[PDB]
Amino acid sequence: AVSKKEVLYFLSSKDAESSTAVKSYLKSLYAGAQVEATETDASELIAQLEKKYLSAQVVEPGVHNIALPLGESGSAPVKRYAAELFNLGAQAGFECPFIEVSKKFGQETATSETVKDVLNKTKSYVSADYNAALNEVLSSVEAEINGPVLFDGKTEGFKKFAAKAKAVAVSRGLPADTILAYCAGSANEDAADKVSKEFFTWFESAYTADAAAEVKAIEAEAASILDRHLAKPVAQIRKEQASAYASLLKRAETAKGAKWAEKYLEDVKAVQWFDASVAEAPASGPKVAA
């Protein structure tokens, strides 16, 4: 069952083993139960840690209900996949990914004062192809000022660094003007909407670009796995797959009392049930009660 804090995340999500648990919880509440006390505790590190480890339990089955658009004609199945992942991030408690990684940027370098360590401490979160170019243009403005560039904003060296890194950003191909005018806003709602109708266009191009990069990586990895697999004779393939399946089955059956092991074994029995149900009536598929 659930422990009164996992069930507060599973309300808006639509994955099956969360929806059936929420439905059994409401079956408990309608049939004469009181709601347990929500904890007014757990100081901020434990709060964001349990957010990190509780949104994981609602995102990780959400990826498996999302089918990859591997090798399809048109960029619109990539838009389907990225929209599904956006909806999964929305139902997982994450924000828009732009403002989410902006929040991570602010969280990472709250204690950085110069601009070289703001490019050092956010090395894991930005592209190294872009981090190398930003470090080299910062070494250029460092050769200009002959002083460490300060990460304050009102410094003239940082102003020249901003006017050079905007050219670096257009050199990467992404327009910094529509993005800065989006997050800086305008007076009237009409010239804010005219900026948003460019920023959302770039935003769609950006998320479909990295989603298409992801499905191209899975396409090439599946092609490499198949081409390393087709070079084997069939008895070696059957022995390797049966031995790997038996070993990872022994790894589950060894864990006695573990909940994940019991769920693993029940899903194995459900897979065998699916094989039996397609074996009984293969004209229509599995037997589903309706």
Partner: protein, 76 residues
């Protein structure tokens, strides 16, 4: 001593820091002060008795918390 805080001291947290600091000296020593400002701490204080240092910081707290939460998830 020599305290270092992220913010300048208010007259409640000054009394609180003096009361929480006297359990780190092994007498009724009239511990002196030398307020210093470093924003590399994310709040809190780091008392430096010039022979030993007690790190009561927030940045050290979150880094030790990250090390402990990394040492548990590799064990569980």
């Amino acid at each position: 001593c020599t305290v270092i805080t992220a913010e300048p001291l208010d007259k409640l947290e000054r009394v609180e820091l003096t009361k929480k600091a006297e359990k780190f000296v092994d007498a009724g020593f009239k511990l002196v002060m030398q307020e210093k400002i470093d924003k590399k701490l994310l709040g809190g204080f780091v008392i430096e008795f010039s022979d030993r240092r007690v790190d009561m910081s927030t940045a050290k707290k979150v880094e030790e918390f990250n090390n402990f939460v990394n040492k548990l998830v590799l064990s569980i």
